[PDB]
Design a protein around this motif. Structure first.
Motif, PDB file in Angstrom:
ATOM      1  N   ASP A  80       0.867  -1.316   0.036  1.00 23.27           N
ATOM      2  CA  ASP A  80      -0.013   0.048  -0.180  1.00 23.27           C
ATOM      3  C   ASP A  80       1.041   1.252   0.140  1.00 23.27           C
ATOM      4  N   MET A  81       0.379   2.101  -0.594  1.00 21.35           N
ATOM      5  CA  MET A  81       0.936   3.616  -0.551  1.00 21.35           C
ATOM      6  C   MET A  81       0.623   4.261   0.751  1.00 21.35           C
ATOM      7  N   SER A  82      -0.735   4.367   1.241  1.00 29.81           N
ATOM      8  CA  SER A  82      -1.388   4.889   2.598  1.00 29.81           C
ATOM      9  C   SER A  82      -0.740   3.763   3.413  1.00 29.81           C
ATOM     10  N   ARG A  83       0.314   3.960   4.133  1.00 29.94           N
ATOM     11  CA  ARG A  83       0.919   3.176   5.157  1.00 29.94           C
ATOM     12  C   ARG A  83       1.797   3.975   6.014  1.00 29.94           C
ATOM     13  N   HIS A  84       2.035   3.544   7.115  1.00 28.24           N
ATOM     14  CA  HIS A  84       3.226   3.713   8.005  1.00 28.24           C
ATOM     15  C   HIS A  84       4.396   3.482   7.711  1.00 28.24           C
ATOM     16  N   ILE A  85       5.578   4.144   7.951  1.00 30.40           N
ATOM     17  CA  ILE A  85       6.911   3.587   7.682  1.00 30.40           C
ATOM     18  C   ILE A  85       7.048   2.379   8.176  1.00 30.40           C
ATOM     19  N   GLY A  86       6.693   2.026   9.313  1.00 29.53           N
ATOM     20  CA  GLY A  86       6.850   0.635  10.125  1.00 29.53           C
ATOM     21  C   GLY A  86       5.673  -0.438   9.779  1.00 29.53           C
ATOM     22  N   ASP A  87       5.056  -0.355   8.523  1.00 33.14           N
ATOM     23  CA  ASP A  87       4.011  -1.487   8.215  1.00 33.14           C
ATOM     24  C   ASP A  87       4.691  -2.463   7.343  1.00 33.14           C
ATOM     25  N   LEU A  88       5.282  -3.481   8.028  1.00 35.61           N
ATOM     26  CA  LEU A  88       5.962  -4.692   7.380  1.00 35.61           C
ATOM     27  C   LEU A  88       4.884  -5.924   7.280  1.00 35.61           C
ATOM     28  N   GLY A  89       3.638  -5.579   7.467  1.00 29.85           N
ATOM     29  CA  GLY A  89       2.588  -6.447   7.151  1.00 29.85           C
ATOM     30  C   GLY A  89       2.646  -7.535   8.275  1.00 29.85           C
ATOM     31  N   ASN A  90       2.551  -8.929   7.797  1.00 35.04           N
ATOM     32  CA  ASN A  90       2.523 -10.092   8.799  1.00 35.04           C
ATOM     33  C   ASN A  90       3.947 -11.011   8.500  1.00 35.04           C
ATOM     34  N   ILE A  91       4.281 -11.532   9.592  1.00 34.49           N
ATOM     35  CA  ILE A  91       5.023 -12.883   9.443  1.00 34.49           C
ATOM     36  C   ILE A  91       4.284 -14.073   9.840  1.00 34.49           C
ATOM     37  N   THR A  92       4.623 -15.202   9.144  1.00 38.34           N
ATOM     38  CA  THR A  92       3.978 -16.561   9.272  1.00 38.34           C
ATOM     39  C   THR A  92       4.810 -17.621   9.641  1.00 38.34           C
ATOM     40  N   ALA A  93       4.375 -18.130  10.813  1.00 35.71           N
ATOM     41  CA  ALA A  93       5.064 -19.284  11.531  1.00 35.71           C
ATOM     42  C   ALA A  93       4.226 -20.402  11.081  1.00 35.71           C
ATOM     43  N   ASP A  94       5.242 -21.642  10.931  1.00 35.23           N
ATOM     44  CA  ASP A  94       4.633 -22.906  10.568  1.00 35.23           C
ATOM     45  C   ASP A  94       4.454 -23.655  11.704  1.00 35.23           C
ATOM     46  N   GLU A  95       3.899 -24.828  11.537  1.00 33.35           N
ATOM     47  CA  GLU A  95       3.548 -25.870  12.520  1.00 33.35           C
ATOM     48  C   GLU A  95       4.609 -26.031  13.649  1.00 33.35           C
ATOM     49  N   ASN A  96       5.813 -25.952  13.165  1.00 32.26           N
ATOM     50  CA  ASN A  96       7.083 -26.144  14.148  1.00 32.26           C
ATOM     51  C   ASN A  96       7.225 -24.915  14.898  1.00 32.26           C
ATOM     52  N   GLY A  97       6.642 -23.743  14.590  1.00 31.92           N
ATOM     53  CA  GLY A  97       6.815 -22.265  15.354  1.00 31.92           C
ATOM     54  C   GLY A  97       7.895 -21.527  14.673  1.00 31.92           C
ATOM     55  N   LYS A  98       8.590 -21.900  13.433  1.00 33.85           N
ATOM     56  CA  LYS A  98       9.633 -21.264  12.668  1.00 33.85           C
ATOM     57  C   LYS A  98       8.886 -20.423  11.697  1.00 33.85           C
ATOM     58  N   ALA A  99       9.619 -19.173  11.441  1.00 35.65           N
ATOM     59  CA  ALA A  99       8.764 -18.263  10.558  1.00 35.65           C
ATOM     60  C   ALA A  99      10.206 -17.600   9.929  1.00 35.65           C
ATOM     61  N   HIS A 100       9.895 -17.724   8.480  1.00 38.34           N
ATOM     62  CA  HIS A 100      11.107 -17.070   7.394  1.00 38.34           C
ATOM     63  C   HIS A 100      10.083 -16.015   6.729  1.00 38.34           C
ATOM     64  N   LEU A 101      10.737 -14.813   6.302  1.00 35.35           N
ATOM     65  CA  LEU A 101      10.090 -13.833   5.599  1.00 35.35           C
ATOM     66  C   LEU A 101      11.204 -12.999   4.866  1.00 35.35           C
ATOM     67  N   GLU A 102      11.038 -12.977   3.521  1.00 34.98           N
ATOM     68  CA  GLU A 102      12.161 -12.133   2.855  1.00 34.98           C
ATOM     69  C   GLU A 102      11.143 -11.368   1.703  1.00 34.98           C
ATOM     70  N   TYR A 103      11.412  -9.858   1.384  1.00 36.96           N
ATOM     71  CA  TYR A 103      10.844  -8.922   0.745  1.00 36.96           C
ATOM     72  C   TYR A 103      11.573  -7.802   0.529  1.00 36.96           C
ATOM     73  N   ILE A 104      11.257  -7.063  -0.496  1.00 38.39           N
ATOM     74  CA  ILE A 104      11.915  -5.597  -0.771  1.00 38.39           C
ATOM     75  C   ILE A 104      10.930  -4.560  -0.298  1.00 38.39           C
ATOM     76  N   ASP A 105      11.557  -3.843   0.814  1.00 36.72           N
ATOM     77  CA  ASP A 105      10.685  -2.740   1.162  1.00 36.72           C
ATOM     78  C   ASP A 105      11.175  -1.607   0.569  1.00 36.72           C
ATOM     79  N   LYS A 106      10.429  -0.527  -0.146  1.00 36.20           N
ATOM     80  CA  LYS A 106      10.780   0.492  -0.873  1.00 36.20           C
ATOM     81  C   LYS A 106      10.684   1.885  -0.168  1.00 36.20           C
ATOM     82  N   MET A 107      10.226   1.768   1.249  1.00 39.35           N
ATOM     83  CA  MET A 107       9.737   2.915   1.992  1.00 39.35           C
ATOM     84  C   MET A 107      10.874   3.244   2.836  1.00 39.35           C
ATOM     85  N   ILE A 108      11.526   1.987   3.707  1.00 38.64           N
ATOM     86  CA  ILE A 108      12.490   2.130   4.887  1.00 38.64           C
ATOM     87  C   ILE A 108      13.752   2.425   4.297  1.00 38.64           C
TER      88      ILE A 108
END
Ligand SMILES: [Cu+2]
Ligand SMILES: [Cu+2]
Ligand SMILES: [Zn+2]
Ligand SMILES: [Zn+2]
Lengths: 151, 148
Positions: A80-108
């Motif tokens: 979104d364009m209408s967002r806070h500088i610190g809106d990195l959305g959600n991180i998703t944890a698997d059944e084992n409680g491990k969570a990976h997340l990689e993307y390109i943020d154009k604001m920070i």
């Protein structure tokens, strides 16, 4: 001398949680590469934000304050364009409680009014719906960490 | 302008050293207030390091002493010192350590900004003479300095 190219943030858990991990922010051509590796999260989507105060001294992570919003914009998703500088959305944890997340943020960035250096990372108990104001109904904070200068 | 800075130190592998350090802007300089637990009784090396990275088990990721002027290692009262030479912190018989003083060098903006840097507590005493570390030895706790 050389402008800051990397940022690192170790998240530690809030009272009655085991959520730990490392988040790196690396500068690339078309923005900043966010890479996050967490453990001890409940299975499912968790609110993942940069908060204005770099203070994780509180048991419940309340000392981190609100979402890092130096432009006084509304809460939204990373895409979104209408967002806070610190809106990195959600991180998703698997059944084992491990969570990976990689993307390109154009604001920070790592310098100026919108610098994330010295701000806090907060992981929430519930999902950020990316609609509800001003938090996205993410609820309680399960982990806190301060963003520092990397090499 | 940033008036306050906060740093929660967590222990490195095989240590229980935790605490909170606040940097408040005051008349003259910046008031440093530190409250630690799980330290061995005696004096411990207490410095700001250049990299705000506590991802390493042994706190090596914090890098060297925050020295943007390329000066020698010294005491807080010394002129010839690194920006992150906060001397020693002293733990009592119970492992509790308190420390408050006015640092005239540290600031929260510019070339010498401590915001986004790391606090490191060492196993041994900083002798304030030996280069470049003061023979402080192993790192027992790490933390990143954030905006208050
Ligand atoms: Cu949040
Ligand atoms: Cu040190
Ligand atoms: Zn937000
Ligand atoms: Zn030094």
């Amino acid at each position: 001398e050389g402008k800051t190219q990397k940022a690192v943030c170790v998240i530690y858990p809030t009272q009655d949680y085991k959520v730990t991990g490392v988040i790196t922010f690396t500068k690339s051509d078309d923005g900043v590469k966010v890479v996050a590796d967490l453990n001890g999260l409940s299975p499912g989507k968790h609110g993942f934000h940069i908060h204005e105060c770099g203070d994780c001294s509180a048991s419940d992570g309340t000392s981190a304050g609100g979402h890092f919003n130096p432009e006084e914009k509304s809460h939204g998703a990373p895409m979104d364009m209408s967002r806070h500088i610190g809106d990195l959305g959600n991180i998703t944890a698997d059944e084992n409680g491990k969570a990976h997340l990689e993307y390109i943020d154009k604001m920070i960035v790592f310098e100026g009014e919108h610098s994330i250096i010295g701000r806090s990372m907060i992981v929430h108990k519930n999902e950020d719906d990316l609609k509800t104001q001003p938090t996205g109904n993410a609820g309680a904070r399960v982990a806190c960490g301060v963003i520092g200068i990397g090499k």
